[PDB]
């Protein structure tokens, strides 16, 4: 986006002041849409010395004469050319600026416009900057942040010591990564993305997107009337153990609820009988195991079962011991079908196997599993989209890094999912998503497309739960999937 | 407004390009509000070589990539700096311009944006300019005019040979006189007035206003609970003749329906009995006349009746013969009360009498009466607000020049009324308005304020008629006045 601004100015020829005017008015319009008529509010505009602050001066100048009171607190030392120009206008228009504030200044105002720092934030916020931000955050006033809440790193979503908590953030051109990843996503409040006059071709060229309803809608496969179950693919799910008998059922139904034609589970006996007692639509093949866990002794039966399917999902509830590790790795090395690799199949995965596979793969770790997989800490991998991209590229796979915002990447293209809620923060929800991805691959979507549609629909289904989200369970999530699909179209 | 633009640029320091960008985007937003989502429409933008055209290029550039198709037809020879700059942007953005058109060009477009001429129009439109405007007008496409429909003189509302007929006109800062006066008001279609960043102080300094609901609301006098009829004034109406027995009744009720405390008519006997048979609330004093018309023989009785009132209205239905002329002029010369002078009292008025009166006056001519009063043609006086202002100033009065748009002036301040409809184009409606003005003066409003409130309310009442406007009559208009008043607050 910095390149996008520079190109719009230097090559397309749009005066930087015009972009800044457009930025500022878009904030006024956004606030009006959120607050209704602005004429009865008193506005405190906090302006840094950069172009964020310059945007803020445009906001302030445009409210002059139209609202009850505007005051700018200018907190910078020096001003960029466009900030200075717009400060100049604010003042010729009759605007009041002050360069100091008392903790009490919030008293006589209703709305705080936060134009202190935008994408130009570098390093931790301290001193007067920090103290005014902590005062704003304690004030209970309505907070509207210009571009990004001040103190969020717009490339990562991290808080640089302290940050503004906004009710409304108005950003320009495109959402920034820091509105999408937490904690930044939380501090952004309601996000409006304003068109400020960039050529649409530049905006559309951005390589890291939010997954939207329209994107998912156009990816959902067709259901031609003259069809039969074979039209809609077959999935094999290799899952479960004597310890974890539930996982296979949740994964299997996840595939069925997204429209897959036939779903087969391979589960150790007698735990396989659990699935069909709950959902008799499922086929649940009993696997004879020595001690209740898959081992090399089941390799041949599983490859056999794989010949007649379009995709194999593996891992939920397998357990993690050496015999499972030997089985999972020899299987994936020999399987020449797309594989969805989850849970304990990730925990025992030899990543050398992924490189040598000619067939595709999607991996679906939560951060704990990703951390163990690449031998880093949870903190180093969580929301680390560049690490996810590198891993995907080096291992020729699609990586689905699960979290409140889920990252979906194949190393070239990266998508961010923002549907869902905390009802998915409960055992089983991951097992459902695994089935969904396998299901969509079986119906003919690419591994990346399948992952994109599934993470969106999985979160949206959770949002459709009628009671308090914390009581949502995986079984209820399954029931909500076809409603999510209907709402998508 | 030209001075207002110049001052905003040259003294306040707003770049002319910023004003032009703001102009153009306001047109896009206005069109969206009128048409809904713009993405399915095809736009033909007709651009002259001036700053109107420059506004048009901003419109076109801002639709690029977002709508189905944009094309600019550039019809000018040369371009002003800002037009050239914005043409330049349109083209760097990937825009298509052509400088010729075929009658068929309207075929492949849904919306025409008319940016040919704005306030820079000088002289009659001919040649290609005229032919494209006549093609647009025959096309049945949706027409959106930038600033003023091309071909309307923005200072007068006159059509300079030919003019665009718009569905929507977006004007900048303030409405222009040519959107307010006909025919211009008709060609404007729906008018939106956009704020493009002028200091509000400059916008508010404009000396010729449209009468709005908020202005009328804040002028309506108070009704304190501890009051009695004397609180609300007394009116005398001197009106009627053996030929015109109805006029007094309509004027008298006009005063009562706006909240006047006591209303007395002086009407030749027996025509006075007509009023109380219809409305027994009225007092209708019988005047003994020789032949059914007021004359000098009634001078003394009328001055006597005038001593106990706050205002006198005179003229509706008096007739126009020499004895009426002698009476009207001697009366007004001697009357030391505010006078509302209408109809036949205007037809016989010696304007020297107005100059020598120490007490105030409001005159309420339609253009035929104004023409006869100043010895000009109806065409010379109709919508001639500068003539109205001169007359008001020279004669120390308020002039209310009635027409579809009514002009109210005291020579310094001029207001335009745009309420009403063609149901008022019928005998009697004027007589009601006379009573209304007298009534509001009696309640303590200045002659100018009284006239301002009355012309608004009189037209708004007409609009509240429930059936087809052409069937509205004065008696029904009277019944609607108190509903107009209630809706105003």
């Amino acid at each position: 986006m910095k390149e996008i601004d520079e190109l719009t100015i230097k090559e397309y020829g749009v005066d930087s002041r015009i972009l800044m005017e457009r930025a500022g008015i878009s904030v006024v319009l956004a606030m009006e849409e959120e607050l209704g008529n602005l004429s009865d509010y008193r506005f405190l505009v906090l302006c840094g010395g950069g172009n964020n602050g310059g945007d803020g001066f445009v906001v302030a100048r445009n409210l002059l004469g139209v609202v009850k009171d505007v005051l700018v607190v200018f907190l910078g030392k020096k001003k960029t050319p466009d900030c200075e120009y717009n400060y100049g206008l604010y003042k010729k228009f009759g605007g009041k600026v002050v360069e100091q504030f008392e903790p009490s200044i919030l008293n006589e105002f209703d709305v705080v416009v936060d134009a202190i720092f935008g994408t130009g934030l570098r390093g931790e916020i301290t001193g007067e900057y920090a103290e005014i931000i902590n005062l704003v955050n304690k004030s209970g006033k309505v907070v509207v942040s210009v571009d990004v809440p001040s103190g969020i790193d717009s490339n990562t979503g991290k808080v640089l010591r302290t940050a503004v908590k906004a009710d409304l953030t108005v950003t320009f051109g495109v959402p920034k990564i820091g509105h999408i990843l937490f904690p930044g996503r939380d501090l952004t409040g309601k996000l409006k993305v304003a068109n400020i006059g960039h050529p649409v071709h530049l905006i559309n060229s951005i390589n890291r997107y939010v997954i939207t309803r329209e994107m998912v809608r156009s990816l959902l496969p067709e259901r031609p009337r003259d069809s039969h179950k074979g039209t809609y693919g077959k999935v094999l799910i290799i899952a479960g153990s004597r310890l974890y008998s539930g996982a296979p059922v949740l994964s299997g139904m996840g595939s069925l609820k997204v429209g897959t034609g036939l779903v087969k589970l391979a589960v150790p006996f007698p735990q396989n009988l659990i699935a069909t007692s709950r959902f008799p639509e499922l086929i649940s093949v009993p696997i004879d195991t020595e001690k209740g866990f898959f081992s090399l002794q089941n390799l041949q039966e599983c490859l056999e079962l794989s010949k007649d399917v379009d995709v194999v999902a593996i891992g939920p509830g397998l357990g993690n011991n050496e015999h499972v590790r030997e089985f999972v790795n020899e299987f994936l090395k020999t399987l020449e079908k797309p594989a969805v690799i989850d849970a304990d199949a990730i925990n025992v995965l030899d990543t050398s196997v992924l490189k040598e596979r000619k067939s595709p793969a999607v991996l679906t770790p939560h951060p704990g599993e990703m951390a163990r997989l690449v031998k880093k800490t949870v903190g180093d991998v969580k929301y680390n989209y560049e690490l996810a991209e590198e891993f995907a590229k080096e291992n020729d796979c699609v990586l689905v890094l699960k979290s409140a915002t889920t990252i979906v990447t194949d190393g070239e293209k990266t998508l961010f999912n923002i549907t869902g809620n905390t009802g998915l923060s409960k055992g089983g929800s991951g097992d459902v998503l695994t089935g969904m991805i396998a299901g969509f691959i079986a119906q003919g979507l690419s591994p990346l497309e399948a992952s994109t549609v599934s993470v969106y629909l999985h979160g949206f289904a959770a949002e459709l739960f009628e009671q308090d989200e914390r009581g949502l369970t995986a079984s209820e999530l399954l029931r909500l999937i076809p409603e999510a699909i209907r709402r998508l179209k | 407004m030209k001075e207002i633009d110049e001052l905003t640029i040259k003294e306040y320091g707003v770049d002319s390009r910023i004003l032009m960008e703001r102009a153009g985007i306001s047109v896009v937003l206005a069109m969206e509000e009128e048409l809904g989502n713009l993405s399915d429409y095809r736009f033909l933008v007709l651009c002259g070589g001036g700053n109107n055209g420059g506004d048009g290029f901003v419109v076109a550039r801002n639709l690029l990539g977002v709508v189905k198709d944009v094309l600019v037809v550039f019809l000018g020879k040369k371009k002003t700096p800002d037009c050239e700059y914005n043409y330049g942007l349109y083209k760097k953005f990937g825009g298509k311009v052509v400088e010729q058109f075929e009658p068929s060009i309207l075929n492949e477009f849904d919306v025409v944006v008319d940016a040919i001429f704005g306030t820079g129009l000088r002289g009659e439109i001919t040649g290609e300019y005229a032919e494209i405007i006549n093609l647009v007008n025959k096309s049945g496409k949706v027409v959106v005019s930038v600033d003023v429909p091309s071909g309307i003189d923005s200072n007068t509302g006159k059509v300079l040979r030919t003019a665009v007929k718009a569905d929507l006109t977006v004007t900048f800062g303030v409405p222009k006189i040519g959107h307010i006066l006909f025919p211009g008001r008709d060609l404007t279609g729906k008018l939106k007035v956009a704020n493009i960043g002028h200091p509000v102080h400059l916008i508010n300094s404009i000396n010729r206003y449209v009468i709005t609901r908020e202005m009328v609301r804040s002028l309506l006098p108070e009704r304190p609970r501890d009051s009695h009829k004397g609180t609300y004034g007394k009116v005398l109406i001197i009106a009627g003749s053996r030929l015109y027995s109805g006029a007094p009744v309509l004027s008298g009720m006009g005063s009562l329906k706006v909240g006047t405390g006591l209303v007395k008519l002086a009407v030749p006997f027996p025509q006075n009995l007509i009023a109380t048979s219809r409305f027994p609330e009225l007092i209708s004093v019988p005047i003994d006349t020789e032949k059914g018309f007021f004359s000098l023989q009634n001078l003394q009785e009328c001055l006597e009746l005038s001593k106990d009132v706050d205002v006198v209205a005179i003229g509706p239905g008096l007739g126009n013969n020499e004895h009426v002329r002698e009476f009207v002029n001697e009366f007004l010369k001697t009357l030391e009360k505010p006078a509302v002078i209408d109809a036949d009292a205007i037809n016989v008025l010696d304007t020297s009498v107005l100059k020598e009166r120490k007490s105030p006056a409001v005159l309420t001519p339609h253009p035929g009466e104004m023409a006869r009063l100043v010895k000009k043609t109806v065409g010379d006086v109709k919508y001639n607000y500068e003539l109205a202002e001169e007359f008001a100033k020279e004669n120390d009065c308020v002039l209310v020049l009635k027409s579809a748009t009514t002009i109210v002036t005291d020579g310094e301040k001029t207001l335009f009324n745009i309420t009403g409809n063609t149901g008022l184009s019928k005998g009697g409606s004027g007589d009601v308005l006379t009573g209304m003005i007298a009534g509001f003066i009696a309640q303590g409003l200045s002659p100018l304020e009284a006239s301002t409130v009355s012309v608004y309310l009189h037209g708004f009442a007409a609009e509240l008629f429930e059936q087809d406007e052409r069937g509205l009559t004065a008696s029904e208009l009277l019944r609607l006045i108190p509903e107009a008043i209630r809706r105003l607050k």
């Binding site: 878009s26 956004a30 409006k192 304003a194 068109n195 | 896009v28 989502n37 713009l38």
Partner: peptide
């Protein structure tokens, strides 16, 4: 839609 995406 022209000015804002949600």
């Amino acid at each position: 839609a022209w000015l804002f995406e949600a």
